[PDB]
Design a binder for this molecule. Sequence first.
Ligand SMILES: *[C@@H]1O[C@H](CO)[C@@H](O[C@@H]2O[C@H](CO)[C@@H](O[C@@H]3O[C@H](CO[C@H]4O[C@H](CO[C@H]5O[C@H](CO)[C@@H](O)[C@H](O)[C@@H]5O[C@H]5O[C@H](CO)[C@@H](O)[C@H](O)[C@@H]5O)[C@@H](O)[C@H](O[C@H]5O[C@H](CO)[C@@H](O)[C@H](O)[C@@H]5O)[C@@H]4O)[C@@H](O)[C@H](O[C@H]4O[C@H](CO)[C@@H](O)[C@H](O)[C@@H]4O[C@H]4O[C@H](CO)[C@@H](O)[C@H](O)[C@@H]4O)[C@@H]3O)[C@H](O)[C@H]2NC(C)=O)[C@H](O)[C@H]1NC(C)=O
Ligand SMILES: *[C@@H]1O[C@H](CO)[C@@H](O[C@@H]2O[C@H](CO)[C@@H](O[C@@H]3O[C@H](CO[C@H]4O[C@H](CO[C@H]5O[C@H](CO)[C@@H](O)[C@H](O)[C@@H]5O[C@H]5O[C@H](CO)[C@@H](O)[C@H](O)[C@@H]5O)[C@@H](O)[C@H](O[C@H]5O[C@H](CO)[C@@H](O)[C@H](O)[C@@H]5O)[C@@H]4O)[C@@H](O)[C@H](O[C@H]4O[C@H](CO)[C@@H](O)[C@H](O)[C@@H]4O[C@H]4O[C@H](CO)[C@@H](O)[C@H](O)[C@@H]4O)[C@@H]3O)[C@H](O)[C@H]2NC(C)=O)[C@H](O)[C@H]1NC(C)=O
Ligand SMILES: O=S(=O)(O)OC[C@H]1O[C@@](COS(=O)(=O)O)(O[C@H]2O[C@H](COS(=O)(=O)O)[C@@H](OS(=O)(=O)O)[C@H](OS(=O)(=O)O)[C@H]2OS(=O)(=O)O)[C@@H](OS(=O)(=O)O)[C@@H]1OS(=O)(=O)O
Ligand SMILES: O=S(=O)(O)OC[C@H]1O[C@@](COS(=O)(=O)O)(O[C@H]2O[C@H](COS(=O)(=O)O)[C@@H](OS(=O)(=O)O)[C@H](OS(=O)(=O)O)[C@H]2OS(=O)(=O)O)[C@@H](OS(=O)(=O)O)[C@@H]1OS(=O)(=O)O
Ligand SMILES: O=S(=O)(O)OC[C@H]1O[C@@](COS(=O)(=O)O)(O[C@H]2O[C@H](COS(=O)(=O)O)[C@@H](OS(=O)(=O)O)[C@H](OS(=O)(=O)O)[C@H]2OS(=O)(=O)O)[C@@H](OS(=O)(=O)O)[C@@H]1OS(=O)(=O)O
Ligand SMILES: O=S(=O)(O)OC[C@H]1O[C@@](COS(=O)(=O)O)(O[C@H]2O[C@H](COS(=O)(=O)O)[C@@H](OS(=O)(=O)O)[C@H](OS(=O)(=O)O)[C@H]2OS(=O)(=O)O)[C@@H](OS(=O)(=O)O)[C@@H]1OS(=O)(=O)O
Ligand SMILES: *[C@@H]1O[C@H](CO)[C@@H](O[C@@H]2O[C@H](CO)[C@@H](O[C@@H]3O[C@H](CO[C@H]4O[C@H](CO)[C@@H](O)[C@H](O)[C@@H]4O)[C@@H](O)[C@H](O)[C@@H]3O)[C@H](O)[C@H]2NC(C)=O)[C@H](O)[C@H]1NC(C)=O
Ligand SMILES: *[C@@H]1O[C@H](CO)[C@@H](O[C@@H]2O[C@H](CO)[C@@H](O[C@@H]3O[C@H](CO[C@H]4O[C@H](CO)[C@@H](O)[C@H](O)[C@@H]4O)[C@@H](O)[C@H](O)[C@@H]3O)[C@H](O)[C@H]2NC(C)=O)[C@H](O)[C@H]1NC(C)=O
Ligand SMILES: *[C@@H]1O[C@H](CO)[C@@H](O[C@@H]2O[C@H](CO)[C@@H](O)[C@H](O)[C@H]2NC(C)=O)[C@H](O)[C@H]1NC(C)=O
Ligand SMILES: *[C@@H]1O[C@H](CO)[C@@H](O[C@@H]2O[C@H](CO)[C@@H](O)[C@H](O)[C@H]2NC(C)=O)[C@H](O)[C@H]1NC(C)=O
Ligand code: NAG
Ligand code: NAG
Ligand code: NAG
Lengths: 616, 616
Amino acid sequence: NLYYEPPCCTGKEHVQDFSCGPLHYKTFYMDERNNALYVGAMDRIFRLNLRNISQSICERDVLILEPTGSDILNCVSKGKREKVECRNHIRVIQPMNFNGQKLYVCGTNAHNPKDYVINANLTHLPRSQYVPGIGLGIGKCPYDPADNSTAVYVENGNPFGLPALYAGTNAEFTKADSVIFRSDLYNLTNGRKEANFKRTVKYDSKLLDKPNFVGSFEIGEFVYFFFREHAVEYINCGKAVYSRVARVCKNDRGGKYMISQNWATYLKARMNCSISSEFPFYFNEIQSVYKMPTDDTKFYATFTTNTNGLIGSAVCSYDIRDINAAFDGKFKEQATSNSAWLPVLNSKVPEPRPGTCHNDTATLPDSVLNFIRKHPLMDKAVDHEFGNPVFFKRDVILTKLVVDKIRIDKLNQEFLVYFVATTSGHIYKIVQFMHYGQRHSNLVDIFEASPHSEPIREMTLSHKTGSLYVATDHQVKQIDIAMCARRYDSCFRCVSDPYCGWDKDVNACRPYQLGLLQDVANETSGICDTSVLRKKVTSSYGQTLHLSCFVKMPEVLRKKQTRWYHHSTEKGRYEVRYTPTKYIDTNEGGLVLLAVNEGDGGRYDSYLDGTLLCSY
Amino acid sequence: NLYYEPPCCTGKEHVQDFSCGPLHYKTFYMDERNNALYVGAMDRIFRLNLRNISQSICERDVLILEPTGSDILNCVSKGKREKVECRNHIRVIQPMNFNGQKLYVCGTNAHNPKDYVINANLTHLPRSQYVPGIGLGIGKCPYDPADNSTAVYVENGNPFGLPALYAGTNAEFTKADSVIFRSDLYNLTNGRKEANFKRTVKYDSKLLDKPNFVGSFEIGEFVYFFFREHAVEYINCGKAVYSRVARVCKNDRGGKYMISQNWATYLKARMNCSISSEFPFYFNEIQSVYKMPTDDTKFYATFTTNTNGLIGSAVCSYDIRDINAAFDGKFKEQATSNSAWLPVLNSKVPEPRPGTCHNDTATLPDSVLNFIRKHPLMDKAVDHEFGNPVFFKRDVILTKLVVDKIRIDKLNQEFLVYFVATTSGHIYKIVQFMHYGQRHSNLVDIFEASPHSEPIREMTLSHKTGSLYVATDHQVKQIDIAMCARRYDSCFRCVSDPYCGWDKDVNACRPYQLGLLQDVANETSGICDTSVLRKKVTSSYGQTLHLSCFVKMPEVLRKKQTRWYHHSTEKGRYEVRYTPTKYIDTNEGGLVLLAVNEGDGGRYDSYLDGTLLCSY
Ligand SMILES: *[C@@H]1O[C@H](CO)[C@@H](O[C@@H]2O[C@H](CO)[C@@H](O[C@@H]3O[C@H](CO[C@H]4O[C@H](CO[C@H]5O[C@H](CO)[C@@H](O)[C@H](O)[C@@H]5O[C@H]5O[C@H](CO)[C@@H](O)[C@H](O)[C@@H]5O)[C@@H](O)[C@H](O[C@H]5O[C@H](CO)[C@@H](O)[C@H](O)[C@@H]5O)[C@@H]4O)[C@@H](O)[C@H](O[C@H]4O[C@H](CO)[C@@H](O)[C@H](O)[C@@H]4O[C@H]4O[C@H](CO)[C@@H](O)[C@H](O)[C@@H]4O)[C@@H]3O)[C@H](O)[C@H]2NC(C)=O)[C@H](O)[C@H]1NC(C)=O
Ligand SMILES: *[C@@H]1O[C@H](CO)[C@@H](O[C@@H]2O[C@H](CO)[C@@H](O[C@@H]3O[C@H](CO[C@H]4O[C@H](CO[C@H]5O[C@H](CO)[C@@H](O)[C@H](O)[C@@H]5O[C@H]5O[C@H](CO)[C@@H](O)[C@H](O)[C@@H]5O)[C@@H](O)[C@H](O[C@H]5O[C@H](CO)[C@@H](O)[C@H](O)[C@@H]5O)[C@@H]4O)[C@@H](O)[C@H](O[C@H]4O[C@H](CO)[C@@H](O)[C@H](O)[C@@H]4O[C@H]4O[C@H](CO)[C@@H](O)[C@H](O)[C@@H]4O)[C@@H]3O)[C@H](O)[C@H]2NC(C)=O)[C@H](O)[C@H]1NC(C)=O
Ligand SMILES: O=S(=O)(O)OC[C@H]1O[C@@](COS(=O)(=O)O)(O[C@H]2O[C@H](COS(=O)(=O)O)[C@@H](OS(=O)(=O)O)[C@H](OS(=O)(=O)O)[C@H]2OS(=O)(=O)O)[C@@H](OS(=O)(=O)O)[C@@H]1OS(=O)(=O)O
Ligand SMILES: O=S(=O)(O)OC[C@H]1O[C@@](COS(=O)(=O)O)(O[C@H]2O[C@H](COS(=O)(=O)O)[C@@H](OS(=O)(=O)O)[C@H](OS(=O)(=O)O)[C@H]2OS(=O)(=O)O)[C@@H](OS(=O)(=O)O)[C@@H]1OS(=O)(=O)O
Ligand SMILES: O=S(=O)(O)OC[C@H]1O[C@@](COS(=O)(=O)O)(O[C@H]2O[C@H](COS(=O)(=O)O)[C@@H](OS(=O)(=O)O)[C@H](OS(=O)(=O)O)[C@H]2OS(=O)(=O)O)[C@@H](OS(=O)(=O)O)[C@@H]1OS(=O)(=O)O
Ligand SMILES: O=S(=O)(O)OC[C@H]1O[C@@](COS(=O)(=O)O)(O[C@H]2O[C@H](COS(=O)(=O)O)[C@@H](OS(=O)(=O)O)[C@H](OS(=O)(=O)O)[C@H]2OS(=O)(=O)O)[C@@H](OS(=O)(=O)O)[C@@H]1OS(=O)(=O)O
Ligand SMILES: *[C@@H]1O[C@H](CO)[C@@H](O[C@@H]2O[C@H](CO)[C@@H](O[C@@H]3O[C@H](CO[C@H]4O[C@H](CO)[C@@H](O)[C@H](O)[C@@H]4O)[C@@H](O)[C@H](O)[C@@H]3O)[C@H](O)[C@H]2NC(C)=O)[C@H](O)[C@H]1NC(C)=O
Ligand SMILES: *[C@@H]1O[C@H](CO)[C@@H](O[C@@H]2O[C@H](CO)[C@@H](O[C@@H]3O[C@H](CO[C@H]4O[C@H](CO)[C@@H](O)[C@H](O)[C@@H]4O)[C@@H](O)[C@H](O)[C@@H]3O)[C@H](O)[C@H]2NC(C)=O)[C@H](O)[C@H]1NC(C)=O
Ligand SMILES: *[C@@H]1O[C@H](CO)[C@@H](O[C@@H]2O[C@H](CO)[C@@H](O)[C@H](O)[C@H]2NC(C)=O)[C@H](O)[C@H]1NC(C)=O
Ligand SMILES: *[C@@H]1O[C@H](CO)[C@@H](O[C@@H]2O[C@H](CO)[C@@H](O)[C@H](O)[C@H]2NC(C)=O)[C@H](O)[C@H]1NC(C)=O
Ligand SMILES: *[C@@H]1O[C@H](CO)[C@@H](O)[C@H](O)[C@H]1NC(C)=O
Ligand SMILES: *[C@@H]1O[C@H](CO)[C@@H](O)[C@H](O)[C@H]1NC(C)=O
Ligand SMILES: *[C@@H]1O[C@H](CO)[C@@H](O)[C@H](O)[C@H]1NC(C)=O
């Protein structure tokens, strides 16, 4: 009996499951104050228990919202399969404050988007009660369930202080239309239409070119959108999908004359996630984006190269000041349909600067309006912090992600732990630290959060309960972000996790307290030299025995050299080289001793990349 | 004693060595009719024995050509280290027919290029004999030894039937100049200067932008150049190094008036080596190029992505008709310094078509001349055969290459074997075949041809002697292209090499004859099922024994699943799953049986990716 780490996480409890059948789950809303996680699904919305999702009943904690038969016949007549496509897949769940806190919901609805307003307890509003501007989600949530959309319900900052839903999706049956859209401005008390809707210019591929959204948030006086689209400026050289960030002013009221339903402050910028060199290596396609609830200045996202050819993913981090810096910089421009994309001199920019917020945007001169009409793309690409990714890996496709922040004050240490999903269903546990003034990282653990054939559709994080939440097509799993005792039974693996520390007095890994052993940055190698598992064993002559450290090698460690050393009194200190018979090497870093004898006995140390793992 | 393949190739003889010290060897010329391989080096040129390079003496088979002291003092005064930089490194060795067959030689010569004419027996010409147009290699071979240059001595097709040396290199001390150059045309009988020199327009980055040549040949009525340079058309999107092919007419006589020393038929085209998809994946940087001596219609080359970021190499094949098709297509154009690169309509092309050969090129109209002056780059990229590479591998940098052709007529099978060098000093043995109307490949073997820290500078192939020739900085090694008996002792490895066939009657691998076993395309799996090594062995109770197929797993096979099956009368047919004690898996695909007993005995088959390897 050697080192052994139990598998994770498919079958103290740290993994909780919930399932009412293959319901194509999607769309998260986490309310930490009420211990509820609202999860959308096909024709259903659930309200789960945040501390333990297994305590929710499929019948008591649900509110079915299946489409109407009139919309089903329309969808079948189009040519779409009625089994899943002509159903209602929820895509928007946002907090809404109308006569108290309620929920805003939106769904595909058999390729006919329709929104609702429901109470927190998953009960419809009184049928006699009317909802101003609700009933049709024409530009609020997509038609096709597979479409990547985004939205956020903003309360403050809009014109006249009214509420509205900023979103970005299709807004037509065919893929022709694609728009960043704001709903009609309604005063929900009196029900009067106080302002028309805002949307990107129709069929202007310079604004959006076959986009795929991954997230959207409200920060300061703006609303930001993260997505990937076809690179309009790369066309002269080839085909490429670039990642973009788009910014609009909350108080944007539109243009003049006939173009009042179009944005007066819409600007987008390419996002830079490359490796610093004379010839950078860009991860151009974004896959997801996460923001911490308490911090509105940092954004984390997953980027991938084109899924064809050689594949590589990467995680980049961006500051709000760097995003605003791109929107405050020069403007890209293509003079004619045959000109090259060149920057604009500051002398030609009209004032007020296009993109800057302004009460009543119709007051702006025709110069400013028509300038931003044909200059949506900023010349500068958004700079990623430190000029390099936080982590990257070859032949891996990374999707959703969630980031946590840890700080041990008495040692003055701050860590960032990234929980990145892979298309193979695994979650990468990646830590970030500062080693001698520079930023490095190290993949701590890899645990399976779903079978290979079941992708991860959505993922969120709860700092209060300290648990990770992953949604798939078949079920929803709750995973703790720290399983020190249940996972790490070795000092080697325990001291590398910032959540954990190795107690030498109880001989077990457990949550970190001051005084326990930990070295995440590997700045003090050999810390576990005294907590190493050493198992002296004398066996009979001739018979062959197996010396090993781990039962099965941990996933993140299998790609490290396992060098065995042997100190014998007659032979001395030397490194064991493998021979066809006596010295056999195992796939778990073990050492087999075929034909044991007198000269074999001695001190046996098993190093792993120059650091002791176990001894015999 | 199981399967065992001896290492290769660092220490019947198939590996022959030659070395007179670290002489920075480079530049090959293979004369199959005289059994001699002319190899350049630092201050020396050698004449080796083609059938056995070890039979050459460092003193009898050499002609030292070290620089003059006047040129050394110049080079030391520049600021270059006199140890290696201020020496003479040969870069051009070409056959020359003057009063019989002689050699043309060119060398760096302490950053002052100088050419010579020497006899085949490595003896200087009589000092009284003069050589027309020889003495200075200003545009004939580079200044810096590390510079990638190319050249070829063409005899027929030039104006007035005179000989000249087409080349491409620096032609200045600084990196400022870079030119495809033709020497002055001299009638070697009378010594009269019959025509001036030809060269690319100076400082025109549209023609060449920091190029790196990899080869050059004469085909038909043209002379082609293969190189990589900065992508002038990619500038509007970023930085990229593209691979180019350049074509000039042999009978090019220059322009009119003042621009007579410039080419009138110079055209270049980007080379396409990508993976076919909606979003192609380009291997943009070429590293070397090989042509078969008997075939002037096929070209093979190694391409790599940018060496920064994620790394990948690939091998592409091109037909002469596809190269000419690009030079016969539309023309790329950038109207202004701020325009985009667009094609030219055929209605605007002047006649005669620029680039087409014409006796006396000064006769062409000013339209044709000035057109090709500003239109050197063809719009079409040279298409690679079958639209995909022949082979590609991740995290490997491939350099020089040589290709052989095999044909077994009685079975109607034609193979192509690629011998591609890696920066780690290894040679990849890659075979190409047709499987159901389509082209596939499979890496047959990987053998070390040089230590890791010693790169491979040049490589050639001799069809007559059937041997491969690799040159490094320290030595020159001769390697046979087929070592069936000395390498393959297993039917599994023997039937995959097109050079080899497994004889079941002598139980050994050996050169292929009709009737022997072979399946390169894996179209008949299980062919070796009767030639499998089966070694029944009964051992004592309790003691642990090791079951294995290979002593050490062959390099090209280590990344394949090793599944052991066990048929016991009581248990039946099943796949052996590894347990922590009894069932141990070795890194060599073996199976260890800890604590042997009665239930363990039985038929033990060891499969490798669904094909039987060995049994017990
Ligand atoms: C190396 O070898 C490879 C293997 O053979 C080869 O692979 C092939 O790669 C392409 C991608 O490069 C694959 O995808 C195809 O792409 C085609 C090109 O589309 C894009 O480019 C269009 C043209 O843009 C150039 O030309 C303009 C006019 O001159 C310039 O203004 C541009 O600046 C640009 O110039 C550059 O390129 C020129 C051409 O080389 C060059 O002269 C110039 O100097 C400069 O370098 C764009 O119009 C187009 O944009 C449209 O579409 C996108 C979305 O796709 C929108 O965002 C835009 O708003 C705009 O609407 C692209 O950017 C496509 O034509 C082709 O599409 C057709 O086929 C697909 C098949 O699925 C259909 O889905 C599609 O509807 C098209 O069908 C239509 O046309 C066909 C043909 O007529 C017709 O049969 C059909 O009925 C229908 O009408 C496709 O997407 C291609 O698949 C790969 N092939 C293979 C076999 O794998 C690689 O290119 C080679 N590399 C080189 C360098 O040669
Ligand atoms: C994401 O983040 C990454 C990390 O921060 C970041 O990495 C950096 O990448 C660059 C490469 O992109 C690395 O290399 C540098 O490249 C610089 C650019 O050089 C090339 O581009 C020049 C300009 O071309 C653009 O602009 C023209 C004018 O507008 C247009 O006409 C062009 O079409 C093109 O436009 C495109 O780009 C615009 C800019 O973004 C954009 O507005 C526009 O819309 C369009 O998209 C070219 O002139 C230049 O070509 C010259 O040189 C090549 C050979 O290099 C020749 O073949 C040409 O004939 C021509 O002569 C390039 O194509 C370089 O300026 C920079 O060089 C300087 O520094 C190096 C350091 O080694 C020196 O060797 C060199 O001599 C230069 O020094 C000089 O300038 C500096 C600065 O003033 C000065 O201090 C010094 O004394 C000297 O005077 C360098 O090579 C760079 O290293 C990476 N940084 C890091 C930290 O790693 C990446 O770019 C980011 N991505 C994005 C999208 O932002
Ligand atoms: O010292 S501890 O904080 O770790 O707790 C003392 C012993 O509890 C165990 C299990 O015993 S039991 O829970 O009473 O059944 O560890 C377990 O408890 C800790 C913290 O206690 S708490 O009640 O759950 O709050 C858990 O950490 S935490 O997630 O709550 O922060 C352990 O989970 S984890 O892997 O650290 O994240 C949990 O371990 S387990 O998964 O149940 O096995 C003992 O652990 S054990 O004896 O090593 O098996 C603790 O004694 S210890 O040896 O010092 O670890
Ligand atoms: O393989 S070795 O030559 O390195 O010996 C290691 C094993 O022998 C023991 C037996 O200990 S005992 O039961 O108390 O007799 O230790 C003995 O050998 C070591 C040598 O290894 S070391 O790296 O030098 O320390 C001796 O060390 S030394 O005298 O050479 O300096 C041990 O003395 S010491 O306290 O380590 O300095 C010596 O034990 S003793 O003190 O003479 O009695 C085992 O070491 S143990 O775990 O401390 O008991 C070693 O394991 S084994 O299973 O017996 O192979
Ligand atoms: O049947 S064979 O053509 O292979 O030749 C008969 C036996 O010769 C050996 C070695 O015996 S020896 O050369 O007399 O010393 O194979 C060797 O000879 C063959 C061909 O004969 S030749 O004189 O060299 O032309 C070589 O093939 S070839 O390269 O010449 O085309 C063998 O080299 S290779 O690996 O096939 O390329 C060479 O094998 S070795 O490198 O010397 O070991 C016997 O091989 S052996 O007994 O298996 O060891 C041949 O008998 S065999 O069992 O049928 O192979
Ligand atoms: O592990 S198994 O149950 O599969 O048995 C395989 C080993 O037993 C032998 C002993 O042969 S003997 O010395 O001649 O006695 O073969 C015997 O077992 C096999 C079963 O394997 S198989 O895949 O079915 O063929 C018998 O086959 S069968 O009767 O089940 O159909 C052998 O008979 S047969 O000619 O293969 O059909 C049987 O041998 S015998 O004919 O009854 O005498 C060894 O096979 S051997 O190499 O042919 O001699 C097997 O190797 S072991 O080292 O003994 O483990
Ligand atoms: C904490 O930091 C320690 C100090 O840096 C780490 O120890 C180091 O571990 C590395 C990796 O094993 C050792 O690197 C050496 O690399 C050379 C070169 O070999 C290279 O090529 C081979 C063949 O392809 C390849 O297998 C190797 O991985 C290398 O890429 C080898 O000759 C050496 O044997 C060794 O591998 C350092 O030498 C080693 N330093 C010390 C002081 O031990 C330690 O692993 C870190 N621990 C953790 C948990 O992060
Ligand atoms: C000649 O052709 C035969 C027929 O094609 C080859 O046999 C085939 O070999 C492959 C590779 O072993 C087998 O592929 C299967 O793949 C599935 C899926 O597993 C995948 O994922 C795992 C985990 O990542 C990975 O390890 C695998 O490699 C796969 O990528 C597995 O479930 C199977 O066990 C097996 O691996 C074919 O099934 C197999 N076919 C047959 C009929 O045996 C043979 O290898 C070829 N021989 C030569 C010399 O080329
Ligand atoms: C989360 O809630 C579920 C119930 O929804 C709990 O599952 C049961 O827990 C008890 C105590 O371990 C067992 O006796 C039961 O057999 C469990 N399952 C069933 C089907 O009854 C679960 O223990 C809760 N976990 C936490 C951490 O609160
Ligand atoms: C190639 O030539 C070398 C000599 O230049 C040969 O090397 C010697 O060969 C004989 C026969 O095997 C040995 O007895 C010698 O000891 C070898 N070395 C020396 C230093 O004398 C080599 O055998 C030749 N190989 C072939 C295939 O012709
Ligand atoms: C909406 O209308 C009410 C009167 O019905 C008014 O008091 C209020 O200020 C208006 N605006 C908001 C945001 O409620
Ligand atoms: C400017 O915006 C403010 C926002 O509070 C608004 O009250 C005001 O009416 C707007 N116009 C002027 C002229 O201040
Ligand atoms: C054309 O080229 C040929 C090549 O043999 C040459 O003899 C002839 O003088 C050239 N000019 C004409 C008009 O034929």
